[PDB]
Amino acid sequence: QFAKPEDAVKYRQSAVTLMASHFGRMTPVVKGQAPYDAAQIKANVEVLKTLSALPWAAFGPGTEGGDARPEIWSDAASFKQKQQAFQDNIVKLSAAADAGDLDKLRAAFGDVGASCKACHDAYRKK
Amino acid sequence: QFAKPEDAVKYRQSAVTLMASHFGRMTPVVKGQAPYDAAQIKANVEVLKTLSALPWAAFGPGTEGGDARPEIWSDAASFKQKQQAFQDNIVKLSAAADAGDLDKLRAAFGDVGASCKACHDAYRKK
Numbered sequence: 001q002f003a004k005p006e007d008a009v010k011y012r013q014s015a016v017t018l019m020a021s022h023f024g025r026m027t028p029v030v031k032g033q034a035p036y037d038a039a040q041i042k043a044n045v046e047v048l049k050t051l052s053a054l055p056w057a058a059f060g061p062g063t064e065g066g067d068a069r070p071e072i073w074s075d076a077a078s079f080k081q082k083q084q085a086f087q088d089n090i091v092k093l094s095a096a097a098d099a100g101d102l103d104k105l106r107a108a109f110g111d112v113g114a115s116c117k118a119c120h121d122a123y124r125k126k
Numbered sequence: 127q128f129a130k131p132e133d134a135v136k137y138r139q140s141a142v143t144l145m146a147s148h149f150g151r152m153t154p155v156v157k158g159q160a161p162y163d164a165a166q167i168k169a170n171v172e173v174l175k176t177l178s179a180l181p182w183a184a185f186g187p188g189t190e191g192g193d194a195r196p197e198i199w200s201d202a203a204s205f206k207q208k209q210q211a212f213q214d215n216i217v218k219l220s221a222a223a224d225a226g227d228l229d230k231l232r233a234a235f236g237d238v239g240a241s242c243k244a245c246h247d248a249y250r251k252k
């Protein structure tokens with residue numbers, strides 16, 4: 001859907017800004033510093049689920065740029081596995097949010113966060 | 127969810143970048159220049175539906191900036207009505223996509239586009 005490669009870079013950077021806000025806005029809730037409203041978090045995690053699928057289609061072939069390391073394209077199977085791990089962790093976070101269980105939420109949230117950091121450590125320019 | 131007002135501006139600009147890409151990538155389909163796959167468009171419009179709700183919460187009180195006109199906050203009822211119109215047009219686009227009807231899709235897509243332009247004409251700095 002991108003007229004030029006720069007358009008894919010702009011799209012993915014926007015997508016990761018959104019996904020990051022929908023993840024990180026739950027930090028105070030997971031830490032107990034903000035109240036836990038199960039419905040609020042269920043709805044938010046549904047948004048995060050949709051957003052979490054979007055960046056990956058904007059690393060198509062030819063969209064080299066931004067802070068994406070080139071190893072994203074040359075180790076395509078290894079990058080796909082960091083992305084799949086992250087998405088399966090998002091499924092576990094959805095399950096926790098749907099269950100309305102703060103303990104389960106905290107654990108799943110930590111797993112998600114670890115998966116974000118693991119991909120950045122390998123595939124995001126420093 | 128924004129530590130500072132600048133964070134709301136960054137979020138909404140990212141949100142409108144995503145929503146714009148998910149809307150505008152359907153232009154070739156509506157024009158017949160790309161094939162119409164009803165399932166493909168149904169899925170895409172589900173993403174657009176989620177995205178289309180996101181910008182509006184990032185014009186909270188105090189988030190003046192970017193290319194948002196100040197009349198967004200001082201004519202809050204009038205801005206809310208441009209946003210509601212746009213969201214009700216998104217509902218009609220969802221219905222068309224769910225029905226798998228290209229004629230209905232084209233008509234709904236045009237209504238959505240008009241609603242985007244009408245809000246920009248009033249509320250987006252030139």
Ligand code: HEC
Pocket residue numbers: 009012013016017019020023024065066067068069079082083084086112113115116117119120123124125
């Ligand atoms: C690979 C499988 C990743 C996962 C999982 C996550 N992120 Fe990511 N992120 C990745 C790349 C390759 C890039 C660079 C994109 C580009 O083209 O520039 C990013 C970027 C971000 C950014 C922007 C940082 C900046 O300097 O602007 C943020 C804020 C970010 N990523 C956050 C984030 C979060 C919160 C994730 C889990 C919830 C997450 N990322 C996962 C690769 C990958």
Ligand code: HEC
Pocket residue numbers: 135138139142143145146149150191192193194195205208209210212238239241242243245246249250251
């Ligand atoms: C008000 C009810 C709006 C509707 C409906 C739509 N848009 Fe919008 N848009 C609006 C504002 C107030 C702004 C500025 C945001 C800021 O703080 O800067 C925008 C911005 C955009 C942009 C970015 C333009 C730029 O110069 O970067 C785009 C690409 C954009 N809007 C597209 C868009 C589309 C495709 C819409 C319908 C599908 C749409 N907008 C609706 C206000 C409103």
Ligand SMILES: O=C1O[C@H]([C@@H](O)CO)C(O)=C1O
Pocket residue numbers: 020023024113114116117120
């Ligand atoms: O909200 C965020 O969480 C991850 C990471 O900090 C988790 O360790 C990340 O990159 C963000 O922007």
Ligand SMILES: O=C1O[C@H]([C@@H](O)CO)C(O)=C1O
Pocket residue numbers: 146149150239240242243246
């Ligand atoms: O894709 C887009 O459609 C609207 C408008 O051009 C429709 O008239 C807009 O602002 C876009 O970025």
